[PDB]
Symmetry: D2
Subunit: 115 residues, 4 copies
Amino acid sequence: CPLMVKVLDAVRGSPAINVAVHVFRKAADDTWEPFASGKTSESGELHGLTTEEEFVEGIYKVEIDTKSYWKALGISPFHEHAEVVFTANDSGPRRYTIAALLSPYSYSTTAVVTN
Amino acid sequence: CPLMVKVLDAVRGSPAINVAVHVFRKAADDTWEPFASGKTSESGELHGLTTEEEFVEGIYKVEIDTKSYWKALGISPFHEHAEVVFTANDSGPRRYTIAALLSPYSYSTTAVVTN
Amino acid sequence: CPLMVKVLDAVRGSPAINVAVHVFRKAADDTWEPFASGKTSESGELHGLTTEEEFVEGIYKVEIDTKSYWKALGISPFHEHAEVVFTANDSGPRRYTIAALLSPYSYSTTAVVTN
Amino acid sequence: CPLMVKVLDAVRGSPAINVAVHVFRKAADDTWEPFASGKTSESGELHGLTTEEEFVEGIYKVEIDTKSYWKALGISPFHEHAEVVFTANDSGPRRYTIAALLSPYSYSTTAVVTN
Ligand SMILES: O=C(O)c1ccccc1Nc1cc(Cl)c(OCCCCCCCOc2c(Cl)cc(Nc3ccccc3C(=O)O)cc2Cl)c(Cl)c1
């Protein structure tokens, strides 16, 4: 799997389950084209977004729908979403894990990139 | 100052100096319209972005140009930029500080909302 | 102020007010000896912990009493406290700010070392 | 596995490999007794520290030897180690993952606690 997303909840100390994730790829006309989407599992993970064939060199945006998640838990958070924007595969094919750790007024994101 | 931005460097243990910051507001036609911008100071801070008069309720995006910062340091980074997207909500006196802590393959952002 | 502590609350998007902070220095017999302490202010800050004269090179521990903070808010937390352990090193004018960002099941700490 | 540690490197965007981890348990005399230790794998993970039988209710400290890690990469970091102190199993047996994300002058730690 070349692109995986993992989301964790810093309030509950749990995976963040059923979080919507949308991936976009920047097109030649500078617009963000829909690329893939899904929801995190019971483990906070989202796999199977793309294939090595389709995940070509480009600029990608991973939008994680954090506000919808918090609101479903009774919390009015600060952010609309977390957005992770990066160039992928520009020094050859890599496997990318995009991890996010969520709180109501903060989040962090890291990437783990491997061969 | 209803809106301040503060950027810190987790590699050097320092303010992140001379980082470009762009603020956008969501318009009517769902377009991100430029709103304010600047470069962080020697203290990693950016003040004077807007006024209480202009900073009305709405959806805002703060783009922090992290990739160019790391390139200036000779360090290969992951993200193109950090994007912080939020709704400004009245209901009383509020000042917003958007803080970001930067590493090459990670960032963190929090909002400190006070009065 | 050669040593400041700043604590922020990632759930409320606010300074973490009235948090107990204890600082220790490593002695000769490898015992943590109390050095300084206080409670964070309304701005989440704790100043006046020590003087340039007393804050010599050595190994220091800053203990931030996070569990009691979350208990005061009625929120079940994971950690007993956050502990920040570091060597203070001269070689020129240096001021240390130990920042912490708190969530119930997570914390983050950075050092901003300036002159 | 009731206790797992995962460590990631925010500079390289990689697991933090070969990081020493020491676990202590607070004894009746208020002293920290050695409990378990190991080093992170190629995946940044450390499994097999303990068993459900031996991992009883108590206050535990997980010390992650971050300074040794950074120094081996040519970096002089701020912290001596990251310390994670928590009560375990005080509302019945749980599975704990202690995750840490490391930078030279910052780290974060979260816990994922499951049934
Ligand atoms: O990644 C995996 O693969 C993974 C998989 C499974 C499990 C775990 C996995 N890892 C993993 C682990 C973790 Cl801990 C993780 O979270 C990373 C959390 C990063 C913490 C956020 C850092 C907060 O920064 C700060 C801090 Cl300290 C202070 C401040 N304030 C100030 C500091 C100084 C001066 C002024 C201020 C201010 O405010 O005016 C602002 C910020 Cl912005 C992630 Cl995203 C993935």
